[PDB]
Design a protein around this ligand. Sequence first.
Ligand SMILES: Nc1ncnc2c1ncn2[C@@H]1O[C@H](COP(=O)(O)OP(=O)(O)OP(O)(O)=S)[C@@H](O)[C@H]1O
Ligand SMILES: Nc1ncnc2c1ncn2[C@@H]1O[C@H](COP(=O)(O)OP(=O)(O)OP(O)(O)=S)[C@@H](O)[C@H]1O
Ligand SMILES: Nc1ncnc2c1ncn2[C@@H]1O[C@H](COP(=O)(O)OP(=O)(O)OP(O)(O)=S)[C@@H](O)[C@H]1O
Ligand SMILES: Nc1ncnc2c1ncn2[C@@H]1O[C@H](COP(=O)(O)OP(=O)(O)OP(O)(O)=S)[C@@H](O)[C@H]1O
Ligand SMILES: [Mg+2]
Ligand SMILES: [Mg+2]
Ligand SMILES: [Mg+2]
Ligand SMILES: [Mg+2]
Lengths: 737, 737
Amino acid sequence: LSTAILKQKNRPNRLIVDEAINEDNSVVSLSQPKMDELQLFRGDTVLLKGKKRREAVCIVLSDDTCSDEKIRMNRVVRNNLRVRLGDVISIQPCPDVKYGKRIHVLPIDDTVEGITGNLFEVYLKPYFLEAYRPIRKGDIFLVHGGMRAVEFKVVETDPSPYCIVAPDTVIHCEGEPIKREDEEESLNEVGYDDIGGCRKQLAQIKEMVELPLRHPALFKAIGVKPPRGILLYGPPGTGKTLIARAVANETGAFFFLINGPEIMSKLAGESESNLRKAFEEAEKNAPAIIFIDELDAIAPKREKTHGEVERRIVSQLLTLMDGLKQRAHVIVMAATNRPNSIDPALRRFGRFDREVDIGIPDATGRLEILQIHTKNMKLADDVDLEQVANETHGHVGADLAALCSEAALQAIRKKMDLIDLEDETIDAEVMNSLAVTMDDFRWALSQSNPSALRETVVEVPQVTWEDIGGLEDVKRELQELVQYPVEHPDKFLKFGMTPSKGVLFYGPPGCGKTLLAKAIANECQANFISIKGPELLTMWFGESEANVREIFDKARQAAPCVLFFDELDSIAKARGGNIGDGGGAADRVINQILTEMDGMSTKKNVFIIGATNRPDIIDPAILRPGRLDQLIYIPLPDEKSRVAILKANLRKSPVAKDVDLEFLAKMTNGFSGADLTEICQRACKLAIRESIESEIVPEIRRDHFEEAMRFARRSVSDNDIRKYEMFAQTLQQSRGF
Amino acid sequence: LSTAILKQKNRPNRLIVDEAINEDNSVVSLSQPKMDELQLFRGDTVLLKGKKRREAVCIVLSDDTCSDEKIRMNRVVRNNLRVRLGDVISIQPCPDVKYGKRIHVLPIDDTVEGITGNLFEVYLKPYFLEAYRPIRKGDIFLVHGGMRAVEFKVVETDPSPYCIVAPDTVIHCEGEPIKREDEEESLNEVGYDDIGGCRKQLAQIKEMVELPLRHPALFKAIGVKPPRGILLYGPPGTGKTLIARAVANETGAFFFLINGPEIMSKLAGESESNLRKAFEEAEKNAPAIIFIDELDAIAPKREKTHGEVERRIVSQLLTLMDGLKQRAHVIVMAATNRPNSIDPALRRFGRFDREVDIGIPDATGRLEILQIHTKNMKLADDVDLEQVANETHGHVGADLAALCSEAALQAIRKKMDLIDLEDETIDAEVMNSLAVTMDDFRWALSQSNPSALRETVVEVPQVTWEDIGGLEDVKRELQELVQYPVEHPDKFLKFGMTPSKGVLFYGPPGCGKTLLAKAIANECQANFISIKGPELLTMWFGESEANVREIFDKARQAAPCVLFFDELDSIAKARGGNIGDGGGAADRVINQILTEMDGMSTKKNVFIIGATNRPDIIDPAILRPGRLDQLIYIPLPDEKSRVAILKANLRKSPVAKDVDLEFLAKMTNGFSGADLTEICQRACKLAIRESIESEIVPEIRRDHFEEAMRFARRSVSDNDIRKYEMFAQTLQQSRGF
Ligand SMILES: Nc1ncnc2c1ncn2[C@@H]1O[C@H](COP(=O)(O)OP(=O)(O)OP(O)(O)=S)[C@@H](O)[C@H]1O
Ligand SMILES: Nc1ncnc2c1ncn2[C@@H]1O[C@H](COP(=O)(O)OP(=O)(O)OP(O)(O)=S)[C@@H](O)[C@H]1O
Ligand SMILES: Nc1ncnc2c1ncn2[C@@H]1O[C@H](COP(=O)(O)OP(=O)(O)OP(O)(O)=S)[C@@H](O)[C@H]1O
Ligand SMILES: Nc1ncnc2c1ncn2[C@@H]1O[C@H](COP(=O)(O)OP(=O)(O)OP(O)(O)=S)[C@@H](O)[C@H]1O
Ligand SMILES: [Mg+2]
Ligand SMILES: [Mg+2]
Ligand SMILES: [Mg+2]
Ligand SMILES: [Mg+2]
């Protein structure tokens, strides 16, 4: 529903297109139910406006040879106003056009080859009947008389659209022939199809920028105020400038790009003139978008800036934003990788109220980025882009572009024996065979250093219930506590009881506390933010009191979310618990945590889960009803659940049929899930060593597990068993004394 | 009494108005007891000056068809100088007016439709008898001869008020016809009726700005000094600029708006000239208001500023404020969202002595904001604005405007199938059916991120005595301790004993310490500030020694107030109590608390309540007679009070008649109120799960409570019972050793 602006299904005005049995660009295919169903008379030349402000023209009425009804062109339009199937192109006539001047010869490379003579009677004499060359700026067509392999481009025209040429016109002979790079920048221009992994953010940008500008009457009639300040933020390299470049040519509004450093590079006084002229030029054209890339470069915080020119620039920008009234229809867009460094006076109502978060893409998002970036390369048949997307975790769009570049370079290194640096040229038999293979991508992955490794990942974890053995009661309770209020809120307000927002996991280590938190988020298809104990202790010593703010509201914007606080014992160990260092477990950090969970409304879908291995040193303040009142105990797996844990851990391992998992389950009494995983890993290491030794078979046999069972260490002692058991019944007693 | 300037009841010069049986704008209704009761002779044309500096004119003496005595017009004046019923419009004649020039034709859209010819004999020939078109700048009237559906506006006039036109006048033909947006900004101009939730602050602003300016003689005769500096402060987006815009057109004084960033955006030297010219222009006109929006932008603290131009600006502003003597009648108003960032030299006597606090509106306040903002939209019939106001808690006026915008956008997204982006227009059958429904508002509420969530809410809590089970003795004591000195202060000075200002709540956790503090504030209709333990520990580590100042005086200005200090054990746990970390519970923070409660006068209505679950680790210094000498013990609920607690918790739940609450009360011996609430919540979860399972009935039955009673955990142990009991008698012994 939120991305409804990007949906094109169930449209009766669209159809599928197939291959063409003919190979002639001069012909077009028509249909009776697409031409005789309206009032389009038999015109001479009609325009065909597709996407990216590009149109095309050909000879109409060139059909009644192939099938009717459905429409189908050749494959030459694969690079002309088309990138994929399923596009609706609005066809509309344009009669009563004016008459323009003529255009002289504009050769490219047709003089140093063959004979030329005059080069005038090969494109104007044979094509003058009912066709006066409806040329336009951006039209590419093939016309000649010697080999039919050269194109021609026009730059001389009085109006913007096409026109009918007329003879007997004087042309000033000062036209310089163009090079190749001037037109090669145009076809590969950035569009909406070059953005990968930002489907959700693109819908928001379209509905708050393009919609208020193309249809201001819709927003005016409904009595609403269209937002005039949009701030794109995210980690560096996520594609903020790419969206700017995409909307700079995919929108029918006057675009004005303002670079951050470019403004700040000017002298004192000359920079404010640039901002004033930019806003004045935008105000002149009613459809207008202003993009201020690198907003943090020109608008830092006025309480920690140094120079006076920066403060004057910030005040000038604030005045310019406030001075835009309603009738101008000017939308100011900005992009920064440091949204917290923006002056707070700018992220206020009426200036930059709207904020779009371009976060790190997930595996599905980055697969699309890889496909977009490799769409112009030549891959082999063994490349698996899904595998590359899965392996990359902290990678952003820039990181994926760098990875593709490194993979391409690795392919070049492999063919250095054939290429000669001292040679004037290199054979074409090795261009066409130069393909990037999967081993090239693996090598690039081996030393790709991602730039978003430290960033908190907000995604849906891949850990399902299948990865967790046993613990059915905990699964049912977690479902009834998280999945229930998010799918059936009507059952909760009827009974008048607010859902409990908060669960604490406690028990012996290595029992599935992290797996349960990830699985409950995976089943509900909700976001999951995992913040560990030591991560909070490191993140605060830099005297940053607001470092829990951007992680608590990060969950809030990603609703529904599961905010997991793993390894709380590490935090609690920093103060000793009851007496410790004099102060309780309520040290500098968790007090912020309690303040933040107290401030979150109960109607929100953000769920908070905490896990600890040391329930004796958690402060009682976190158990208060309203924060983490739900105390779910995670016991050691028993006879029945150990078989399930082993089966879950051995799902990806070729275990032979003779392995009796029940016997190993019954032999290990006080073994946690981590101990069983360690047993399986030791068995696999034994199998790997056996295979390597026997190389100078690829199945885990009974003896492999028998040998690994000998060294199996128990992680939880008998005394810890009784302590955890007596603590599973008296944890809520911690509040009071 | 404080808002007496906004009261209009018991006025004999007012009456109610009903609908009109006639539909003719050219007629007006008169009455004998409203026309023959004064000395108004039978004039030709009389003005009718309403509100917002707007007046209207029509043909007088057009009655004696409908009923007399009472007055009633048509519904066409619903947008002309009227927004609601109950308005008194001062009627006064204006004879001996001068004669002005003429006005040429000012067409709008009457040339591209129909026939025009001359367009002169359709508004001047048929209307010249005893009516010379008393036109004025801002008059809208309907006059034509073809369809009577076009209006006309004048801009050409020599004087300000209306005049009698005279023929044979030469007009310079240079008048450019006006567009639509130039007049569309005027009717929707901000007025006093566009302010929601600031009824109290508007009365203060009117009585310290409009009153001293409209009637300086009243202030001079009484021998008082009218304040000449008003500072509006509050959280961002609360409506400070909106009040500026409202007083800019609702007051009969020369308004001069000074923007903060607009001054600071000028060059060195040019900014001071702007301030000097602004003050000079204000001094020229005796009724004058100067508004300095974003005062913190131009007047930061001189001890932590960086540039010299800022210091020069601050000194110039100080000199300009001090240079205003008494006879100028110039009132300087300022608005900032950071009142603590203002230079302290400016918030002194004679400069900005008066301060008006525009805080976050309550539910009633924000309901009015929602009504004001949706007054121009088209809602459905299922929308409940009271529900939206109740659900929004940390929302301010800007947040509510954004929520309304998001709700309107959600409505547009639902109708994307009918609207066509490629179409040149869209059908009018979907404008009129485009209504925002309640589910649209629910979706907008699901991800509205309020900007005032961290702000300390100062409101009257909704927790009444009905929400608290039992504890009648504590209720009576709290009444006799808080409600008594605030309603009957005469009974206290007679006996000569000062009321005890301070109560400490101690006892086992989950017994109603927070509920009692909220209920005692709700019954007395007093404000309530809840500051928790961890909130104080987080709020101080940023090395902010003045962070308890703005919360203690916040209670002082909101008198009567109940300053609640909940979860004091979390504060006391930060030092260990008796020995702990060597220091006692008197750490960095509570020493400020004791200093602040020592400084508050006993005649104030601010009441301080503290609550703790660990009375063994509170320092004795807080129990000193004069701070929290009243030690109210909150015991565990007994047989009799548990039934009341269950009834209070089950007031909003459909419990069946077969549930015997006395039996569950007698079965749970050492159960706190939180334990009973948890039992009820578990029973409701069981009922919800049963209903969901049976879906593939909506009443809590006996078995639901029987099952939930099995897992009911006791929160307070037997040892804690005896410790709390022995501590309930010897808490005052803590002072001394
Ligand atoms: N979603 C994406 N889809 C496709 N290509 C992408 C995407 N994100 C990034 N890229 C590529 O990576 C490059 C990184 O540039 P940008 O991310 O646009 O720069 P930026 O977003 O302004 O971040 P900075 O420069 O560090 S502040 C882009 O120019 C693209 O080539
Ligand atoms: N119930 C289980 N089913 C399957 N594997 C499990 C289970 N419990 C633990 N494991 C294994 O043990 C690893 C650690 O799981 P965690 O959820 O992190 O345990 P924990 O209770 O959080 O304690 P630690 O301190 O994190 S080891 C998992 O990655 C699994 O390999
Ligand atoms: N009480 C209110 N009644 C009606 N509309 C309101 C109210 N408060 C805010 N608004 C709306 O929300 C917008 C917020 O703008 P303002 O609050 O006036 O700006 P501000 O008060 O100067 O706060 P800043 O700009 O963050 S310092 C207003 O323009 C109104 O549209
Ligand atoms: N007397 C009571 N009547 C009804 N509900 C109660 C009562 N006492 C406690 N509760 C419930 O328990 C919850 C907690 O109430 P509080 O006043 O916060 O208890 P407390 O004494 O302050 O101890 P904590 O640490 O806050 S749980 C309330 O929201 C109610 O749901
Ligand atoms: Mg950029
Ligand atoms: Mg873990
Ligand atoms: Mg303002
Ligand atoms: Mg409490």
